[PDB]
Amino acid sequence: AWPKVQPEVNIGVVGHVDFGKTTLVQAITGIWTSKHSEELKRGMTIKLGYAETNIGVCESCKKPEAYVTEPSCKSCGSDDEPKFLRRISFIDAPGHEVLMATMLSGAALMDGAILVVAANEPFPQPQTREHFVALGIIGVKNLIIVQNKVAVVSKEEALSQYRQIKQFTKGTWAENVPIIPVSALHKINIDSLIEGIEEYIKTPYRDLSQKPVMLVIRSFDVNKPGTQFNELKGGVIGGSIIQGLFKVDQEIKVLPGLRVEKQGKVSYEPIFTKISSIRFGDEEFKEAKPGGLVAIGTYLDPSLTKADNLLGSIITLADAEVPVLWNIRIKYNLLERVVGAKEMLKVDPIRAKETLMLSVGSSTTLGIVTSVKKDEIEVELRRPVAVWSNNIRTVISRQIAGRWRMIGWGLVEI
Ligand SMILES: Nc1nc2c(ncn2[C@@H]2O[C@H](COP(=O)(O)OP(=O)(O)CP(=O)(O)O)[C@@H](O)[C@H]2O)c(=O)[nH]1
Ligand SMILES: [Mg+2]
């Protein structure tokens, strides 16, 4: 008698490369997130992976084994069904070096986070530190550190690394962050991770008063090949809602929208449409709340949505007043040292005329610095950015050693 509702919380899974993120998400949800051919062939995550599962508890059994991801208490004794707590979803971020820009985007969609640390690898490491301080910046401080691959190391070594993690987090915003030893591959001590999720990653408060805003991270064409032009389904736009709620048959718009070429001149025109369908995985719904990753059916030509073309864009109501800016002011603060790089090196102050990478919401855009002050910089963006609210958290990256590395953050001023 478990209800078929949408996920109510987004838990991001971040960490260094090949530490077992996707295998962990599979160990919990039973689903392999990587569905693209490229990432299945290369054996990594390239685009944000998604997977969801129900969470329940057999309140007549002993925790943490009392927790289940399916409506059955046969594994603990009683034949009655467990108490449905909530449905959760995971955002599986890539742990690769040159995919940081993706992770940041995913971080805009996270309510809580899990940081995967390999027990068979030394601590700390590049993308570990980087994703850590990134989560600190974004505001995803509902964190759980997971000691994966614990089955290949002795308890002495596991505790040895544990001490190092506690030392590392000692004196930071993550000082009291829990550390849970699991084995994603062989499914060892997963129940404790479920329990930890329920304890430390609670479902946030959603103020439905705020205007409906969705951050787009994917878009595609559900039309199977050779489909005649009369049976062509509308374009589908996928992403996460950060505030408010969307309903079917609602008038919406995509910002900045569509790139337009007029004899070499480039502009951007908002994409107006109507929600034809809303789904969360295989289940279809009439509403769409924050938490989970929603597929929004539109009346758009599939040509516009094909191949994640609307990535980074946002979706609001048609009559919403939203500034789409080519130039933005940012009240910034820089990091002290470049955390992503393998070599320890400090970060130069923002130079005029310098080109930077800005992560605003789910959008990554390059821009040239036009004004430099102690607390504020002004940037001329190569492409427009939709700024739905005031004080939007942005992430500032600079190209170092040929690769874009995070150097600091800021808030978008309007
Ligand atoms: N022994 C052991 N091996 C594991 C565990 N988890 C993952 N692995 C191994 O790591 C390999 C890749 O793990 P994967 O889950 O893809 O790591 P990832 O971090 O998602 C890859 P990327 O960071 O590039 O997106 C797998 O072949 C698997 O054998 C674990 O808990 N124990
Ligand atoms: Mg992966």
Swiss-Prot record:
Binding site residues for Zn(2+): 58, 61, 73, 76
Cofactors (names): Mg(2+)
Region (G2): 43-47
Pfam family, one: GTP_EFTU
Effect on the protein of changing residue 18 to A: Reduces GTP hydrolysis 8.5-fold. Completely aboloshes GTPase activity
Tagged with keyword Metal-binding: yes
Uppermost EC category: hydrolase
Binding-site residues, GTP: 18-23, 148-151, 183-185
PROSITE patterns in the record: G_TR_2
Region (G3) residue spans: 92-95
One GO molecular-function entry: metal ion binding
Sequence segments annotated as region (G5): 183-185
Stretch list, region G1: 15-22
Residues reported to bind Mg(2+) 2: 18, 43
Enzyme Commission number: 3.6.5.3
Subunit (UniProt): Heterotrimer composed of an alpha, a beta and a gamma chain.
Name the record gives this protein: Translation initiation factor 2 subunit gamma
Source species: Saccharolobus solfataricus (strain ATCC 35092 / DSM 1617 / JCM 11322 / P2) (Sulfolobus solfataricus)
Gene from which the chain derives: eif2g
